[PDB]
Amino acid sequence: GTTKHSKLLILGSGPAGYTAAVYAARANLQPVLITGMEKGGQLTTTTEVENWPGDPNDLTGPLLMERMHEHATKFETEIIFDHINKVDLQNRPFRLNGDNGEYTCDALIIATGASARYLGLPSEEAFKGRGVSACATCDGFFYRNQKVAVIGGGNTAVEEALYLSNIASEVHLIHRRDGFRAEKILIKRLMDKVENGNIILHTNRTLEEVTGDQMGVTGVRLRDTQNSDNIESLDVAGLFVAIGHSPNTAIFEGQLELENGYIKVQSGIHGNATQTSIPGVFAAGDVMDHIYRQAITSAGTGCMAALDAERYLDGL
Amino acid sequence: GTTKHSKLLILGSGPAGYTAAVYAARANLQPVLITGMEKGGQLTTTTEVENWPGDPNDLTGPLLMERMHEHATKFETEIIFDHINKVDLQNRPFRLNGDNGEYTCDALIIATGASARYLGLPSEEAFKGRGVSACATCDGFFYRNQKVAVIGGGNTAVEEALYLSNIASEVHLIHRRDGFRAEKILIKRLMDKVENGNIILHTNRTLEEVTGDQMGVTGVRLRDTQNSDNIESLDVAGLFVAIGHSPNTAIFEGQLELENGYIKVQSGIHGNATQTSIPGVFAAGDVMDHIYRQAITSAGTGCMAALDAERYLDGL
Ligand SMILES: Cc1cc2nc3c(=O)[nH]c(=O)nc-3n(C[C@H](O)[C@H](O)[C@H](O)COP(=O)(O)OP(=O)(O)OC[C@H]3O[C@@H](n4cnc5c(N)ncnc54)[C@H](O)[C@@H]3O)c2cc1C
Ligand SMILES: Cc1cc2nc3c(=O)[nH]c(=O)nc-3n(C[C@H](O)[C@H](O)[C@H](O)COP(=O)(O)OP(=O)(O)OC[C@H]3O[C@@H](n4cnc5c(N)ncnc54)[C@H](O)[C@@H]3O)c2cc1C
Secondary structure, eight states: OOEEEEEEEEEOOSHHHHHHHHHHHTTTOOOEEEOOSSTTOGGGGOSBOOOSTTOOSSOBHHHHHHHHHHHHHHTTOEEEOOOEEEEEOSSSSEEEEESSOEEEEEEEEEOOOEEEOOOOOHHHHHTBTTTEESOHHHHGGGGTTSEEEEEOSSHHHHHHHHHHTTTSSEEEEEESSSSOOOOHHHHHHHHHHHHSSSEEEEETOEEEEEEEOSSSEEEEEEEOBTTBOOOOEEEOSEEEEOSOEEESOGGGTTTSOEETTEEOOOOSSSSOTTBOSSTTEEEOGGGSOSSOOOHHHHHHHHHHHHHHHHHHHTTO | OOEEEEEEEEEOOSHHHHHHHHHHHTTTOOOEEEOOSSTTOGGGGOSBOOOSTTOOSSOBHHHHHHHHHHHHHHTTOEEEOOOEEEEEOSSSSEEEEESSOEEEEEEEEEOOOEEEOOOOOHHHHHTBTTTEESOHHHHGGGGTTSEEEEEOSSHHHHHHHHHHTTTSSEEEEEESSSSOOOOHHHHHHHHHHHHSSSEEEEETOEEEEEEEOSSSEEEEEEEOBTTBOOOOEEEOSEEEEOSOEEESOGGGTTTSOEETTEEOOOOSSSSOTTBOSSTTEEEOGGGSOSSOOOHHHHHHHHHHHHHHHHHHHTTO
16 A cells, blocks of 8 residues: 655545645645545535625535635645545554555644435435525525424524524424423523414424425425324425534544534634644534534635644744 | 614624625624725735635635625625724613714624734835735745745734745845844744745845836835944845734724734634624624634634624524
8 A cells, every 4th residue: 555645634625625725735835635535525415505705696515616626726736535544643643544545644634524414215315405405504595484394303403493483484393202302592492482483393293205396395294293193294495404413523533532523623812723632633614613514614714724734834 | 863773783894794794694684784994895905816715716805805795785785884983882782883873783793804004115005916915825825936025023024924934935034123023932933944044034124115117026125234324135026014913993992802902702612702702792804813814714703703693683
């Protein structure tokens, strides 16, 4: 096997990885970026994007990522198609083992993301990008003054339902259990919106099917209750599956400090904000952010990571 | 006078103000944005921008800001051309006095920036955007393998000279004093680059003139020493005036916690990262960031501020 050394190595080809690559390349660091299996990241799984600032019309997730790829290669970023399966971050240089070889580096930017999970239903698969969504902040404004359904039982699902009730005419929260596995302040606000307004609760229901026409989702078929096969039918314009994200950090367990699988960074207002618990290793994007989860915040921390990496590499 | 109330008010029309406006508008908050005197912010004072991610070619600062304005107005952001001169943030709703009236709001996003200072020389005025720059991270890659001059004596100037020595063939640091008003770790690294390389020091010199041709800067004329009018002439491709920034926060003194004029935010990885010392008041952009100072990091915190504001306005 081969062993390639780089001063700076970037893991991930989503908005955080690519912005860190254009800032590192314009700092004359000659960055090497490893793409992972999902070349272009999570945005290649969506259709229209209208909250990337400065792109009012006609943008899709694939088109933004094609442009980001162009930007990085313009500044001669070395892009390798490989995926990392093992890491040693306790010796110098850091050693990373991929499928096509070994990589060592003096500084590392981890931008591996936190991918959305779906239900696995064929009717859900059918309507992705045309009515089924996994991000309410992203797509909730398309369903303004319309009926919407959210499915899930954790913190994310109550958060998405709560955000959506200020946009949609009504929100239908669907869950298998007879209660939510969410935060105290979230369930207080939820029950206030249930009693004095917008959110219709649907506990002890499971999602059987996503129905729709040629243009998209028009309904959702539910079933069960506490002992009976009741079956409900709901007229809805969009479904927001909110069952959780999977931070891509199993490879870092026992190496870096994690917080529910998310990489813990230093943060703060005094610099070196993207540094993880190991000096020389930095993180950017959704892998270190479980609150905002946007392409613009991922590009912002990607930039911070490249400048923190440059300052580290120069003894500051 | 008029007194207009808004649920959410945004101050500033730079990248942070406009991104907070598109995220607030797509959250159905109907944001009101007040532009300030400098409509479009600091980026309207520069020429080519090639580190806004996903825009590899043909972008200028004015064009990005024209597009951001379009994006905000597409989502019906109410834009007011006015400037705030007095503020009361200790009573509810917050009261802000402008030149064309009074404004009250339930949540406030401050995105007023930190403007760069120049020397005030007519020859410097002449070459702005074509050889004279105030941001080395921004424009340093255009002067790769070329000679460059930085003028200033504080932390910023030593930081800019240090960053530039990895790009430029040589860096000429110019200062009036016989020493730098900078950090301990910065001056150690500076003196290492002075002795073993790239940085040529020019203490007890002042800048008399910026010379150049039709395409841009080709030189710099210096004068003085400790008792003598020596006059040096330097062949250089770019001048980086690094004498400091002015956070636009005089209006907030005694109201919010400041740190060398920069608004202190909560930061962190657990949400509500842009909140200042007052609940309901948030900050984004260069006004709260003295480390990275980029349009992409300003747009990223603009987004965080709008989502923090939305969560605040909804009792979370
Ligand atoms: C349905 C949906 C719609 C969305 N719509 C929007 C929208 O309209 N606007 C918006 O702002 N945001 C949107 N988002 C959120 C946005 O997709 C994410 O915030 C953003 O993509 C995160 O960027 P990232 O670079 O952190 O990670 P990701 O884009 O997740 O990319 C992670 C990268 O890391 C690589 N990687 C993973 N593991 C390894 C490994 N072991 N070795 C090497 N590489 C590895 C992957 O292959 C991938 O390239 C949406 C998300 C979803 C799921
Ligand atoms: C010479 C130069 C070149 C640069 N080039 C680049 C580049 O290539 N790429 C890059 O990423 N970054 C670049 N930058 C940095 C970039 O300009 C800033 O990071 C960014 O503009 C900051 O955005 P902001 O929204 O925080 O504030 P600003 O853009 O500074 O805008 C502040 C806004 O607040 C308003 N305001 C101020 N006071 C008041 C008040 N009292 N009432 C109401 N409104 C008020 C102002 O009118 C203005 O609209 C450059 C900077 C300079 C100076």
